């Protein structure tokens, strides 16, 4: 057999400990590039002029950060949306100053994670599975695209992309609230329902199946040993679990069909996170949360504050302080 | 950086003691 066909058989082999696949041919180099750059930058990169105002922010461990404060810092506002590969810099020193590692990491990462998604489709096809696990992953993937790609596009700069760090994430969230009132946006409210409900239903499902495990073990051993990998029979009594849960609420508020139950578990968090990803992606174009500032006024016209006005006071404190040296003109229009 | 010097021993013991506990239990599980 010819070299090409032997290579193709290897790439798509279902016997590799980790599936490679055609999506993997791009995923592996791009994830490695991003991972290696991220680790080296997080430990040792010098300070980055994120906002383009010649005020470098130190993100790396060797330059005085810990795990919580460290970040790979977004590229300079002076760059905006321009592509800044290493070979566009006069020197590595310039590239580090202006935040080049951030572009390299996020682009290779977004490319690699998109192929991760395709790879999930691909293996499911080689194994004879149904194909939609990749659709579930599209919810986190879209979320990553929103904060690393779409939001920078709409706002005109990767300097307003999410930083690759723990405290940098918090910075991104606070500024976002000030400029968009995301808490008052229903797509973020839907995201919270998605993740609170996902955790609720996660604990519900685990607790109801755990509650109705069939006695297969003694009190000495782990009950986990009553299930054998590959066993044909179910290890719990779903009728019993339905019997418990139907009475806890009422009979029809409880699932009797395992397939319907598990589709619900998939659908609820995925849809919710689709909406919150769409929230970031549309506030990227400045269609912001509801504005009820001074919405209630009395018979004379005095403003009667509501809780929305109190949120607005906090928002204003965030607004006037963020990037304290970066604005010269009174409106922060991006 | 002016960190707490006891931070090093706290972290080292935080890792070592629990980890050693698990390793002891695992190894003697394997040898029976």
């Amino acid at each position: 057999a010819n070299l090409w066909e032997r290579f193709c058989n290897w790439v798509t082999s279902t016997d590799n400990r980790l599936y490679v696949g055609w999506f993997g041919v791009i995923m592996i180099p791009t994830l490695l590039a991003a991972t290696i750059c991220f680790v080296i930058a997080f430990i040792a990169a010098p300070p980055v002029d994120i906002d383009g105002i010649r005020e470098p922010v130190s993100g790396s461990l060797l330059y005085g950060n810990n795990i919580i404060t460290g970040a790979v810092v977004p590229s300079s506002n002076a760059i905006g949306l321009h592509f800044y590969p290493i070979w566009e810099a006069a020197s590595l020193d310039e590239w580090l100053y202006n935040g080049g590692p951030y572009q390299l990491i996020i682009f290779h990462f977004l490319l690699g994670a998109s192929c991760y998604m395709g790879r999930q489709w691909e293996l499911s096809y080689r194994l004879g599975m149904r194909p939609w696990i990749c659709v579930a992953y599209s919810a986190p993937l879209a979320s990553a695209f929103a904060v690393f790609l779409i939001y920078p596009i709409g706002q005109g700069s990767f300097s307003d992309g999410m930083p690759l760090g723990i405290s940098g994430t918090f910075n991104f969230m606070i500024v976002f609230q000030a400029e968009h009132n995301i808490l008052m946006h229903p797509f973020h409210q839907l995201g919270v329902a998605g993740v609170f409900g996902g955790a609720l239903f996660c604990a519900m499902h685990g607790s109801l199946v755990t509650s109705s495990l069939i006695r297969e073990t003694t009190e000495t051993e782990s009950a986990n040993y009553g299930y054998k990998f590959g066993q044909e029979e179910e290890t719990y009594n779903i009728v019993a679990a339905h019997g418990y849960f139907g009475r806890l609420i009422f009979q029809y508020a409880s699932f009797n069909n395992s397939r319907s139950l598990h589709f619900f578990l998939a659908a609820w968090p995925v849809v919710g996170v689709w909406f919150t990803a769409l929230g970031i992606s549309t506030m990227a174009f400045n269609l912001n949360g509801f504005n009820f500032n001074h919405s209630v006024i009395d018979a004379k016209g005095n403003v009667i504050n509501t809780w929305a006005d109190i949120i607005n006071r906090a928002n204003l404190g965030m607004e006037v302080m963020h990037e304290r040296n970066a604005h010269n003109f009174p409106l922060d229009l991006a | 950086m002016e960190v707490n010097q006891l931070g090093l021993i706290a972290t080292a013991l935080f890792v070592l003691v629990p980890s050693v506990f698990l390793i002891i239990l695992y190894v003697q599980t394997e040898s029976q």
């Binding site: 461990l61 810990n66 | 960190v3 090093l8």
Partner: peptide, 30 residues
């Protein structure tokens, strides 16, 4: 010392990944 400590812990985790994947207890059908 604190940089060394953070990198050390992170390096142990990467090592753990290696063993967890390639020296897992193999799942057996039975």
């Amino acid at each position: 010392m604190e940089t060394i400590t953070y990198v050390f812990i992170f390096a142990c985790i990467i090592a753990l990944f290696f063993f967890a994947i390639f020296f897992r207890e193999p799942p057996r059908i039975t």
